[PDB]
Amino acid sequence: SLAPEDGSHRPAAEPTPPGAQPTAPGSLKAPDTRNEKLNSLEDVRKGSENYALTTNQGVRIADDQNSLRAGSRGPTLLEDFILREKITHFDHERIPERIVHARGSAAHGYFQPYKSLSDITKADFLSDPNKITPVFVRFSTVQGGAGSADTVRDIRGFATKFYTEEGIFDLVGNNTPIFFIQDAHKFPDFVHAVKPEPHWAIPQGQSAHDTFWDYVSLQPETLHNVMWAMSDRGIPRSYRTMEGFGAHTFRLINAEGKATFVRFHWKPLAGKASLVWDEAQKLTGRDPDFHRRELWEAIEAGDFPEYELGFQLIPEEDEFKFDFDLLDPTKLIPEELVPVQRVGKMVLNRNPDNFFAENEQAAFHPGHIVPGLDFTNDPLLQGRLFSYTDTQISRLGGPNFHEIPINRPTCPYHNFQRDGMHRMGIDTNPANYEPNSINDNWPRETPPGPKRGGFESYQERVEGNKVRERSPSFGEYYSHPRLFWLSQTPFEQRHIVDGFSFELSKVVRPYIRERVVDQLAHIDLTLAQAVAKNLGIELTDDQLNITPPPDVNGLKKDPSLSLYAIPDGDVKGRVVAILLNDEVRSADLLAILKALKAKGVHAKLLYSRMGEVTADDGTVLPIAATFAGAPSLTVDAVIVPCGNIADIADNGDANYYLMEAYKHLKPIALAGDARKFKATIKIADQGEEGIVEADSADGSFMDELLTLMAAHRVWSRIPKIDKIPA
Amino acid sequence: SLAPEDGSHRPAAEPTPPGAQPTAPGSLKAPDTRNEKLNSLEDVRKGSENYALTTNQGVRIADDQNSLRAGSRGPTLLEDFILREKITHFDHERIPERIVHARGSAAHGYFQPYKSLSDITKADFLSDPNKITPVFVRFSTVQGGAGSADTVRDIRGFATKFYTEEGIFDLVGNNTPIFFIQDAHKFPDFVHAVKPEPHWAIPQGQSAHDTFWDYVSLQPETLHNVMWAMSDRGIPRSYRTMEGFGAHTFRLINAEGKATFVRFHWKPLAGKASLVWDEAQKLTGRDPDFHRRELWEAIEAGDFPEYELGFQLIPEEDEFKFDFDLLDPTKLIPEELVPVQRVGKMVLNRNPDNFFAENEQAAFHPGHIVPGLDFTNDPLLQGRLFSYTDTQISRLGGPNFHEIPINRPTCPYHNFQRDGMHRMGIDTNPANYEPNSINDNWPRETPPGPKRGGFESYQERVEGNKVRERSPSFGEYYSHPRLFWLSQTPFEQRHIVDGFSFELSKVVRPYIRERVVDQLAHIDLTLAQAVAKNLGIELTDDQLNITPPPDVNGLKKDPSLSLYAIPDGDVKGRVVAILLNDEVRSADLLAILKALKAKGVHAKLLYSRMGEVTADDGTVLPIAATFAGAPSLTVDAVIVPCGNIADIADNGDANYYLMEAYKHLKPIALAGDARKFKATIKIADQGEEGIVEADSADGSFMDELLTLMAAHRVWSRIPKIDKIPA
Ligand code: HDD
Ligand code: HDD
């Protein structure tokens, strides 16, 4: 019942490209990768090799194949305590998934600042460019269950737990710089509207349904984040290729007590890249685990996800200086007005050992701040502070959630709190209260100060009556949506139009579509007309006369809002499909593989069956997957080397592979006789931008392909795709 | 007052076909559809129209848009009890999902027997053909979470709660007649192996991964249910078009105390029908809720799902008369040996009101039997009896899950059990123990009897030592897989071959593929060779020499094991895509639509945009969805009426629609000029079986199409589709 004699059951404990080895728990794959937090989990990591199988009580089991019965065809006996322990534990494996962001993928890593920020913050983790702070990061979707798909259109979560020497700091952000709503009190209304509808629990992972567009049409504050969700930001290529944002204005507090307003940013060093909608959708079926898998494999390959932490900083005296309210989380701060200052780099360099223990049980909460940080009055942030503590009581079984290993501080924690379900800490303090004389008052309060001080809130002035009232300054809904729209490239605009058109086409009640289109007419008439057309709606004269909203502080556009306007391509960690034939020209493959390796681009070798093919020079080529098993959806570009092309010329799946990649705007490269495939995707003999062709795969051929891959997708091809049946 | 003044926000309370109206809670959609259980839920149904919005304590809310703060831009106050109640309930909405069958869709209905079964069972619900028993049924997948996709390849659950006059009877079955393993002690090993792998939590909703095939390769008892899952059984068209089975041998006990062994069956009156793999997988992406949705809409349309309950019955004296053990749940009872006797009909005729409250909280458990039934020593069933009670303690929060309204018996329940979390029932009995004199010993035990008696177990003889030992009678693994294989049509066999080839191709460790192939070589060499070819694996002479397993009691096949060998087509409730153009020939549409209506087949009118198109004669045609919005995956056939075909002849989506429908073997009909599309799918001028074509949609056109639909798919097309790129 055992391992194969060759040791091929066990993956190498070395960095390896996606698909080369089976994936494995982080500590077995990369045992020499360490940080303070990873090491501190060693008390609870449990091995297996050479150990006897036991009950949870430590009793060795002799027969784990059978229940205890009265004769071998008889009834099962109640005294079989081994069976009931095993079954009882199985029967209770599940815990409540998170209310929102139930679907997510996580990894370990570390953070360090570029330079001390003690001028603006006394936060210890930002005080020294050579103090490393471990992190645990969870990326997520928002609406779907823990078993929903990755590549849905949705906001993405981006939560980072920093295990600092002065306490845990959780920066709990999303991949867009705003949220749908203004006050936490409306959170259950918004989330109930986007979630599956309550009578039938449909649809999963989709805002494309009546209730969501109902709420949107009636709550125009939502339109800004909806524009982002309908843009390609809603369907990222990978969690490594999206931005992160804290959304709210927080405060930094320095040693001298000065407060500075701050918004948080994460910049992806692998660049910004998203899928296209037909590709993302079809991908939730071909591989609902695509982003989870891609993150885990990138880490196993050494393509560590890296992010730059950046701050937008606004002096206190500048609170009222924009034409929007800094505390309104439906408003972004344009980088043209306030630049992002580089703060530090985060590297994710190890996967967890057990998803449930480390990922599913992790609890992030934006109230977990540290000295040198503070809140503001943002009314959405204010209510979040209540929820993230409260929800852990059911999700994680009670108030000792900070004792679940993933959640534990690596710095000291001591206080007079006691008991609770599943209490691990055994307190020896004679006192469980303070003030106490019986333990000389320990543990003791600590005055605030420059470093290692107690937490004291910034003494912000509060003046007003007790009111349930929206600030009048929040009552503007169109100008940020319009600034975002004007900042996208024409093809990004087209995809926004297509997203609204596609979603609203799935709204059954036509008046809801109409009301949404009327809201679009208040943002931008070209957008509104283009959506209306697709819905067979005609704008009224009044609608055509709606005055567009004002510019944002004089800005006609801000290109930092676009995924693609300013190139920031990085091909390392991307992947190519190489479509094999039964007689590959080995000279082509040599050159292809060598150029890709030089840029850290991975390859997957595909064929019409599994096993091996032999190349022209006798090289045996192992096959990663079939053309159907690993579709073009899962790769960044497609290369077809020369060889016996007749072998694959009339294979439907091979031809379709190229048609799907073509439709989805990916680079394709055809060497020698592989150019016969140009007829399948209707390329003229002259060739075209985005299809690489030559007599063979040489220096030039690969350089070309790699240049296209750095530009991500071939946007100039878009007019040519609506005619192809794919 | 936000409803549209035309009342179009509210769906009509009358049966309407899929897509015609928004879906609704069953009691608002079909208020006159009643049964005793639905009626008994009235005490907890909560309405809404005309009511003031309140806290849960009944306090009217004035402003549900804002938190209470100090100043309208000030901090949120802890005294906002309205905010905290509303966020608290939200923060705790989730409960743990089911350990297995997390993904399920459910409906209300009723059951009635055809005639009294008093001669063979004293079960009250089967005693009288005029006794109607309310039921609640949940259908499910097995592996994936509650938010996973419906049309995965997996076993399906089919669980029926009968609310009988003598107690709840739960018939908790699946859509295949056996299970993967023999003894309940291995259920967590099997389930852990099929579920997402523990390091990374991948893959969702798929057995296509290493650990599953590792376990199967090492436990040949699994192979029979694996054959079922690899066939088109693993991807049903609808919950209305699969079979249901209790799997285990149970007992019926009559008034005279005679036991008869029984296996339970559900026959779908809508026939057996499945998807094909490429369609199924793509549909998990285009509509992960397809089966849930199809069930709900069939019920709203009046196409109620109906099933006939049947029994395979075996006298006690025949226990040992088969080549396999009756208590072995890896073995089926071939209907050629033991016919299914028709017992009664179940009709599902109303959707729930609230999915969480009725579907998510429902608790089914096969130990919930009633006098007139009993168990056997089947060692899988024996362990199930422990699990389904235990698991509710966490899932539903304690031992009072029977007081959750969907779970309550409709008949009396009284006992001495008290307290527990969530206790609803307020006991007034002076006594909470028996025997007692202080309440005259009430409630009292009831002797067994012909009717309305207490439950007494059949006094089966037990003789043996206390052993953890598998019966040697269970040690045969191959002959049932082989009988199943030999019973399939050739196209079914090919689909089995492709299901194994596709799954093993996702298994990263090659030695596991090889070991599975070797197991197949023990079942049937043709199967094993065909899967080996697809994997690039060469059978050894030893493997080519393995002698096949014996016939099952002289059977070389049983056609009842095939989905399609014996025609059982039913078109009612199926759906057709109609591809419109901007000037449709109205006479064609009249003929098509009326022909479909007469046979209970639905239509969806599709185009390149939403809104309307106008026919030749000026009739205005409402568009249901776009070609891309409602892909051919979601229909059973496609009809292209004549008109201005030039409108759509160059539309990539229109073309691809037909290519996808064609690849997946679906009937396609083309009228007048729509026949120019013949070139898109490569049909010969003189046409082919499975393509209907004529000058118009008059005469025999619609009959020919409906005939194809009654046969489900165009299996003869299979050799044609391999070369088409779609
Ligand atoms: C007042 C309610 C509330 C509102 C207004 C917000 N959140 Fe939240 N959030 C929760 C209440 C909550 C929560 C219900 O507490 C969750 C799910 C359950 C839990 O553990 O946290 C959560 C989870 C959650 C996660 C997933 C953390 C993880 O991976 O485990 C992220 C990334 C965010 N939130 C980010 C945001 C952003 C960017 C918001 C707007 C700027 C926001 N939340 C507003
Ligand atoms: C000893 C463990 C055990 C084993 C051997 C089985 N089950 Fe089971 N089953 C459970 C333990 C369990 C459970 C974990 O207790 C579940 C999930 C949560 C629940 O309430 O019951 C369940 C759920 C469950 C459901 C879903 C009910 C619903 O819709 O809520 C169905 C249809 C079945 N089972 C059917 C089967 C079949 C056909 C089996 C093999 C013949 C089988 N079970 C063996």
3-state SS, B393-404, equals HHHCCCCCHHHC
Burial of B53 (0-12, 13-18, 19+ CB in 10 A): exposed
In three-state secondary structure terms, A605 is strand
Q: How far from chain centre, in Å, is Cα B294?
A: 11
Closest residue by Cα to atom 14, ligand 2, is B99
Burial of A39 (0-12, 13-18, 19+ CB in 10 A): exposed
For residue B319 the two structure tokens come to: 């226990």
The span from the CA of A154 to the CA of A175, in Å, is 10
| Among the listed residues A661, A675, A666, A676, the one whose alpha carbon sits nearest the alpha carbon of residue A705 | A666
- Residue A609 has its nearest CB partner, among B146, B288, B536, at B536
Is residue A379 a contact partner of residue B69, using CB atoms and an 8 Å limit?
yes
Residue A598 alpha carbon to ligand 1 centre in Å? 41
Helix and strand numbers, DSSP H then E, in chain B = 21, 20
Q: What is the residue whose two structure tokens read 């899967």?
A: B531
For residue B489 the two structure tokens come to: 């049509």
Closest residue by Cα to atom 12, ligand 2, is B384
The span from the CA of B476 to the CA of B644, in Å, is 64
A-to-B residue pairs, Cβ atoms closer than 8 angstroms: 451
Q: Hey, which bits of B144-274 come out as E strands? A: 157-164, 167-174, 244-245, 250-253, 259-268
Q: What is the residue whose two structure tokens read 């209310």?
A: A99
The span from the CA of A302 to the CA of A121, in Å, is 33
Is residue A276 a contact partner of residue A232, using CB atoms and an 8 Å limit?
yes
Within 13 Å, how many C-alpha atoms sit on residue A522's CB side? 15
Within 13 Å, how many C-alpha atoms sit on residue A134's CB side? 23
Closest residue by Cα to atom 8, ligand 1, is A384
The DSSP symbol for A70 reads E
Can you give the C-alpha Rg of chain A in angstroms?
A: 28
For residue A568 the two structure tokens come to: 């920031």
B662 belongs to an annotated ligand binding site? no
Is the Cβ atom of B305 under 6 angstroms away from ligand 2?
no
* A536 CB within 8 Å of a chain B CB: yes
Say if strands A259-268 and A250-253 run parallel, antiparallel, or are unpaired. antiparallel
Is residue B511 a contact partner of residue A5, using CB atoms and an 8 Å limit?
no
The span from the CA of B675 to the CA of A657, in Å, is 28
* A351 CB within 8 Å of a chain B CB: yes
Q: How far from chain centre, in Å, is Cα B394?
A: 25
Residue B399 alpha carbon to ligand 2 centre in Å? 18
In three-state secondary structure terms, A170 is strand
Alpha-carbon distance values, B460 to A8, A515, B465 (Å) = 51, 70, 16
Q: H or E stretch including B484?
A: helix B479-487
Question: What is the phi/psi pair of residue A359, to 5°?
Answer: -80, -65
Residue B100 alpha carbon to ligand 2 centre in Å? 7
How many angstroms separate the first and last alpha carbons of chain A?
46
In three-state secondary structure terms, B212 is helix
| Among the listed residues B326, B425, B341, the one whose alpha carbon sits nearest the alpha carbon of residue B377 | B326
Q: H or E stretch including A658?
A: helix A652-663
Angle at the Cα of B625 (from B621 to B630), degrees rounded to 5?
A: 140
What residues of B are in contact with residue A387 (Cβ under 8 Å)? Answer: 87, 90-91
What residues of B are in contact with residue A652 (Cβ under 8 Å)? Answer: 721-726
Is residue B324 a contact partner of residue B484, using CB atoms and an 8 Å limit?
no
Is residue B712 a contact partner of residue B564, using CB atoms and an 8 Å limit?
yes
Within 10 angstroms of residue A329's Cβ, the number of other Cβ atoms is 28
Judge if the upstream peptide bond of residue B443 is cis by omega within 30 degrees of 0.
yes
Which ligand 2 atom sits nearest the alpha carbon of residue B157?
32
Tell me the resolution in Å: 1.9
**What is the distance in angstroms between the Cα of A498 and the nearest Cα belonging to chain B?**
11
Residue B341 alpha carbon to ligand 1 centre in Å? 56
| Among the listed residues B392, B424, B292, B406, the one whose alpha carbon sits nearest the alpha carbon of residue B357 | B406
The span from the CA of A657 to the CA of A628, in Å, is 8
In three-state secondary structure terms, B629 is coil
- Kindly write down the DSSP assignment for every residue of B445-464, as one continuous string: -----SSSPPP--------S
Is residue B577 a contact partner of residue B637, using CB atoms and an 8 Å limit?
yes
For residue A605 the two structure tokens come to: 């070798």
Say if strands B612-614 and B620-622 run parallel, antiparallel, or are unpaired. antiparallel
In three-state secondary structure terms, A394 is helix
For residue B276 the two structure tokens come to: 């094909």
| Among the listed residues A666, A698, A707, A708, the one whose alpha carbon sits nearest the alpha carbon of residue A585 | A698
Q: What is the residue whose two structure tokens read 């062994």?
A: B261
For residue A606 the two structure tokens come to: 């595909």
For the beta sheet containing A625-626, the strands, ordered from the edge strand earlier in sequence to the opposite edge, are A625-626, A602-607, A575-579, A637-640, A668-671, A691-694
Q: Which residues of A are catalytic?
A: 101, 174
Closest residue by Cα to atom 6, ligand 1, is A384
Is residue B136 a contact partner of residue B207, using CB atoms and an 8 Å limit?
no
Within 10 angstroms of residue B440's Cβ, the number of other Cβ atoms is 9
Q: What is the residue whose two structure tokens read 């908790």?
A: B172
Closest residue by Cα to atom 36, ligand 2, is B173
- Residue A77 has its nearest CB partner, among B286, B466, B610, at B466
Judge if the upstream peptide bond of residue B435 is cis by omega within 30 degrees of 0.
yes
**What is the distance in angstroms between the Cα of A607 and the nearest Cα belonging to chain B?**
11
3-state secondary structure A409-452: CCCCCCCCCCCCCCCCCCCCCCCCCCCCCCCCCCCCCCCCCCCC
Is residue B626 a contact partner of residue B652, using CB atoms and an 8 Å limit?
no
The span from the CA of A524 to the CA of A479, in Å, is 10
The span from the CA of A599 to the CA of A386, in Å, is 47
Cβ distance of B91 and A377 shorter than 8 Å: no
Closest residue by Cα to atom 15, ligand 1, is A388
Cβ distance of B286 and A283 shorter than 8 Å: no
Q: What is the residue whose two structure tokens read 């994680």?
A: A396
Which ligand 2 atom sits nearest the alpha carbon of residue B390?
15
What residues of B are in contact with residue A77 (Cβ under 8 Å)? Answer: 466
The stretches of A41-104 forming alpha helices (DSSP H) are 81-91
For residue B721 the two structure tokens come to: 């589709």
**What is the distance in angstroms between the Cα of A430 and the nearest Cα belonging to chain B?**
33
Alpha-carbon distance values, B257 to B110, B121, B167, B368, B462 (Å) = 28, 9, 20, 20, 18
In three-state secondary structure terms, A202 is coil
Closest-CA residue of chain A to B200: A355
The span from the CA of A642 to the CA of A671, in Å, is 5
The span from the CA of A688 to the CA of A668, in Å, is 11
In three-state secondary structure terms, B555 is strand
Residues preceding discontinuities in chain B at C–N > 2.5 Å?
none
Can you give the C-alpha Rg of chain B in angstroms?
A: 28
Within 10 angstroms of residue A435's Cβ, the number of other Cβ atoms is 8
Name residues whose C-beta falls within 8 Å of residue B686's C-beta, 6 or more positions apart in sequence: none
**What is the distance in angstroms between the Cα of B350 and the nearest Cα belonging to chain A?**
12
Is residue A87 a contact partner of residue B383, using CB atoms and an 8 Å limit?
yes
Say if strands A602-607 and A575-579 run parallel, antiparallel, or are unpaired. parallel
Burial of A430 (0-12, 13-18, 19+ CB in 10 A): exposed
What residues of A are in contact with residue B502 (Cβ under 8 Å)? Answer: 626, 628-629
- With a Cβ cut-off of 6 Å, ligand 1 is lined by A 98-101, 104, 138, 140, 157, 159, 172-174, 179, 184, 187, 247-248, 329, 362, 364, 380, 383-384, 387-388, 391, 395; B 87, 91
For residue A70 the two structure tokens come to: 């009265």
* A568 CB within 8 Å of a chain B CB: no
**What is the distance in angstroms between the Cα of B128 and the nearest Cα belonging to chain A?**
33
Cβ distance of A84 and B386 shorter than 8 Å: yes
Name residues whose C-beta falls within 8 Å of residue B153's C-beta, 6 or more positions apart in sequence: B206, B207, B208, B229, B230, B234, B235, B277, B280, B281, B499, B503
What is the identity of the amino acid at A236?
Answer: P
What is the identity of the amino acid at A720?
Answer: K
Name residues whose C-beta falls within 8 Å of residue B322's C-beta, 6 or more positions apart in sequence: B333, B337, B553
Alpha-carbon distance values, A533 to A220, A536, B525, B618 (Å) = 22, 5, 59, 21
Angle at the Cα of A145 (from A144 to A151), degrees rounded to 5?
A: 45
Alpha-carbon distance values, A623 to A613, A659, B535 (Å) = 8, 22, 10
Say if strands A691-694 and A668-671 run parallel, antiparallel, or are unpaired. parallel
Per the rule left: phi > 0, alpha: psi between -120 and 50, beta: everything else, B452 is: left
Say if strands A625-626 and A602-607 run parallel, antiparallel, or are unpaired. parallel
How many angstroms separate the first and last alpha carbons of chain B?
50
| Among the listed residues B682, B688, B656, the one whose alpha carbon sits nearest the alpha carbon of residue B669 | B688
Is residue B614 a contact partner of residue B582, using CB atoms and an 8 Å limit?
yes
Is residue A370 a contact partner of residue A125, using CB atoms and an 8 Å limit?
yes
Is the Cβ atom of B140 under 6 angstroms away from ligand 2?
yes
| Among the listed residues A212, A475, A85, the one whose alpha carbon sits nearest the alpha carbon of residue B390 | A85
Q: How far from chain centre, in Å, is Cα A349?
A: 16
| Among the listed residues B527, B518, B544, the one whose alpha carbon sits nearest the alpha carbon of residue B482 | B527
Q: What is the residue whose two structure tokens read 């981006």?
A: A158
Choice from B95, B101, B233, B376 to test ligand 2 binding pocket (greatest atom count within 8 A of CB): B101
Residue A519 alpha carbon to ligand 1 centre in Å? 27
The span from the CA of B321 to the CA of B399, in Å, is 43
Is the Cβ atom of B98 under 6 angstroms away from ligand 2?
yes
Closest residue by Cα to atom 3, ligand 2, is B384
- Residue B185 has its nearest CB partner, among A65, A504, A725, at A65
Within 10 angstroms of residue B502's Cβ, the number of other Cβ atoms is 19
The span from the CA of A645 to the CA of B35, in Å, is 66
Is residue B368 a contact partner of residue B168, using CB atoms and an 8 Å limit?
yes
The span from the CA of B645 to the CA of B585, in Å, is 10
Tell me the ligand closest to A328's alpha carbon. Answer: 1
For residue A14 the two structure tokens come to: 């070395």
Cβ distance of A87 and B203 shorter than 8 Å: no
Q: H or E stretch including B341?
A: strand B340-350
Which is the catalytic residue, given B174, B175, B359, B407? Answer: B174
Which ligand 1 atom sits nearest the alpha carbon of residue A329?
41
Domains of chain B (ranges; CATH) run 24-409 (2.40.180.10), 469-572 (1.20.1370.20), 573-726 (3.40.50.880)
Per the rule left: phi > 0, alpha: psi between -120 and 50, beta: everything else, B712 is: left
Which ligand 1 atom sits nearest the alpha carbon of residue A395?
20
The span from the CA of B354 to the CA of B360, in Å, is 9
Is residue B176 a contact partner of residue B228, using CB atoms and an 8 Å limit?
yes
Say if strands A341-350 and A259-268 run parallel, antiparallel, or are unpaired. unpaired
Burial of A410 (0-12, 13-18, 19+ CB in 10 A): middle
Per the rule left: phi > 0, alpha: psi between -120 and 50, beta: everything else, B236 is: beta
